[model samples]
Target: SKWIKFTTNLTPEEAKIVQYELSTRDEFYRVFINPYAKVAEVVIDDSKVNIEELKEKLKGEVIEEKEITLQELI
Candidate 1:
């Protein structure tokens, strides 16, 4: 999971643009906007994609980002 937090809340316009762009990428499994945290979470094969380059395409200035474990319980 590549969790990217933006400085401002993402609007529908921006999300839609990104959604279309990411949709063509076979490396990415999903792309969703997270409202509570003003974040855009994108799941992808990070090893194959350069996150630094990918992040440059985001609509707003990113404040925080990292790989996250959604959670797993045995």
Candidate 2:
């Protein structure tokens, strides 16, 4: 599966909670790709493990990413 990187500015505590909650595809889907958000709708694939799934699997263990919006940076 191809890995994906997401940039976030969340605090360590937030990251920890996110990691704990999104340790699985089901959790990631439920949290970010639900009917309303659909942010992760195209992130998963049937043939491959999908990017979001890979990231979720990594969670706080191996995933290396950050969420930095220009506005936040400013």
Candidate 3:
């Protein structure tokens, strides 16, 4: 499976909500957040998480989007 990397800047409060939602996925995905920096990174396998829905959910815009492989991340 391929993983996708999504980076966005959002308010601390909003990042909390985003983090909570992504965390619910458990083994399905891995989520990283830096609320102080207002940044989040979520890696998912093959599941096509909706970017626009997330934008709406966080009330924020994506700063960058890319598909990354494990090798590149390591």
Candidate 4:
């Protein structure tokens, strides 16, 4: 299965907070953030987290959302 991914529209500063919060999670995974693009990427193995839960965790910091995939990178 493909890895879990999350793309948000948080600003650089706000996104930093999101990144920090993600680091505090008690899950085993990797997280990547692109402040310049207001995007966050999370890679989780085996487990899955609720997307709605993540949105709530952001505390309304996101103004928009978009989808990006590995294939899009190429």
Give per-residue CA lDDT, model 2, range 1-74, as digits (tens): 12233323334433443454445434344233233331222222223234443444346433344422122222
The Cα local distance difference test for each model comes to 0.45, 0.35, 0.45, 0.44
Model 1, 33-67: lDDT tens digits are 44445444543333334444345454444543443
TM for every model, in the order presented, reads 0.41, 0.22, 0.36, 0.37
Ranked by TM-score from best down, the candidates are 1, 4, 3, 2
| Winning candidate number (TM-score) | 1
- RMSD from true fold, candidate 4: 5.1
Worst ten-residue run, lDDT, model 4? Answer: 65-74
* Model 1 residue 50 lDDT score: 48
Poorly placed runs, candidate 2 (over 4 Å): 1-10, 30-74
lDDT of 3 by residue, 1-74 (tens): 43333444545654655654554454434444455664444443424354433444444334544434342354
lDDT of 2: 0.35
Model 1, C-alpha of 11: deviation from truth (Å) = 1.1
TM-score: the better of candidates 1 and 4: 1
Q: After superposition, how far is residue 11 of candidate 4 from its true place, in Å?
A: 4.6
Off by over 4 Å in 4: 1-11, 17-20, 39-48, 51-53, 65-74
* Full-model lDDT, candidate 4: 0.44
The true-versus-predicted C-alpha distance at residue 38 of model 3, in Å, is: 3.7
Off by over 4 Å in 3: 1-4, 13-30, 42-61, 69-72
For 12-49, candidate 4 gives per-residue lDDT tens digits of: 55365455455446652444446566445543331344
| Pairs that collide, model 2 | 7-66, 7-67, 8-66, 8-67
